[PDB]
Amino acid sequence: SVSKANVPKIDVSPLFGDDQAAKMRVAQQIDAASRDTGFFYAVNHGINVQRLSQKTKEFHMSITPEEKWDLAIRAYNKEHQDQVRAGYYLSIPGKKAVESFCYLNPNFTPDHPRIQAKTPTHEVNVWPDETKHPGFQDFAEQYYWDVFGLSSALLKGYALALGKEENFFARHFKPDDTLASVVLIRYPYLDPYPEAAIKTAADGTKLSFEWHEDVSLITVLYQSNVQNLQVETAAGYQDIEADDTGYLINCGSYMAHLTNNYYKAPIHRVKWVNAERQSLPFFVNLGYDSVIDPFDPREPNGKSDREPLSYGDYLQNGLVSLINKNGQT
Ligand SMILES: C=C(C)[C@@H](NC(=O)[C@H](CS)NC(=O)CCC[C@H](N)C(=O)O)C(=O)O
Ligand SMILES: [Fe+2]
Known part of the structure; x- marks a missing residue:
């Protein structure tokens, strides 16, 4: 069998307060995890993840095929040319098992300057009908801000970890302009499970999603309590344990760029598991024109x-490349 990866649990609650010394002790833990496997669990994070999971399940299990077309991104519905990122990503029964719903910054409204300009990577969110999904949009928008708040705290810990002032990343992570996304991914239980929907790694491991580095500054993930992720290390691919009370945190390739690979973007992959489960990442992206000078x-x-490298240049190039490499989700 594969060995278990070292994924420490870090109590991040000091990052929300004013005890600077305690924040430094959290920062050290982040430094150590980032230099090791590249993953940690943030605990004592203050977010109600069980409610997140319940609301997400009510949405995934009640949305109909009709609504999925009506919300679909451009890859599935040519009528929706403005929906590149935000909307519904359909499953293809027999071929692609996973389906998802992505949304962006709720402040990307029709009058937002970047939306008026039609700047790449900015879009106005699409939502299902309120009567069919009562409370869902309100819940989902508030979740964006709850995970934004956790992410801002985490970014203060990464900044302190790198020898910087605590706002070094967070000053570029702003409610009015962040390019961050939430994705509500549904992995289904299927009997039988179509082989075409199962990928196979060179080592023989059955996968739902192949090896990659994330397109993000950091990724802040809630998943069901079902083991599935693996991280490549010196000792080969190792299993990341499940923990559906904590958030799984890792760096993306923008952090690797800024730190000259001091904090690498860990290569990881998703094992195939025949289980009805959820994967709810928040990709922590900066603003379109945010540029941090690289250091070492x-x-x-x-x-x-x-x-x-401006964040907008990074992001636009990355999202395309990930689709070309690992397929349209
Ligand atoms: C565990 C995870 C975070 C998931 N991975 C993905 O599905 C991949 C690689 S992390 N994610 C993406 O395809 C990036 C989505 C970006 C988003 N659609 C956007 O526009 O921001 C997964 O569960 O498969
Ligand atoms: Fe990832």
């Missing part, structure tokens, strides 16, 4: 030979 916390003078 292993170099005496802190300098890096990487060029600055």
Whole structure:
């Protein structure tokens, strides 16, 4: 069997308060986890994840095929040319088992300057009919802000961990402009489970999603309590334990770029499991024009030979590349 990955549980509650020394002790834990497997569980995070799961299940189990077409992104519905990121990602029974619903910043409204400009990666969210899904949009928008708040706290810990002031990332992570996304992914139980919907790794492991690094600064994930993720390490792919009270945190490739791989974006993959479950990531993205000068916390003078990259350039290029590599979700 594969060995268990070292995924420590870190109590992040000090990151919400004003005890600077305690924040440093959290930052050290983040540093250690980021230098090791690249994953940790954030605990004492303050979010009601059980309610998140319940509301998400009520949505996934009640939405109809009709509504899925009507919410579909462009990849599934040519009539919806503005929906590149936000909307419904359909399953293809017999071929693609997973389905999902993505939404973006609720502040991306029709009058937002980036929406008026039609700037890439910005879109106005689409939502199902309120009468068919009472309370869902309100719940989902509030969840965006709850996980935004946790993410801001986590970003203060990553900044302190890297030797920076606590707002070093967080000053570029703003309610009015963040490109962050929530994805409500449904993995189904299927009997029989179609082989075409199961991928196979070079080591023989059955997978739902192949190896990748995340397109994010950090990723802040709630999943059901069903083991499925693996992380590549020196010792091969290792299993990340489940814990559906904590949030699983890892860095994405923008952090790797900014830190000159001090905090790598861990390569990870999703095992095939025949289970009805949920995967609810929040991809922590900055603003379109956010640029942080790359640095190197292993170099005496802190300098890096990487060029600055705006977050919008990073994101637009990354999302396309991930689809080309691992397929349209
Ligand atoms: C555990 C996870 C976080 C999930 N992974 C994915 O489905 C992949 C790789 S993390 N995610 C994406 O395809 C990126 C989605 C970006 C989003 N659709 C957007 O527009 O922001 C999974 O469960 O499969
Ligand atoms: Fe990922």
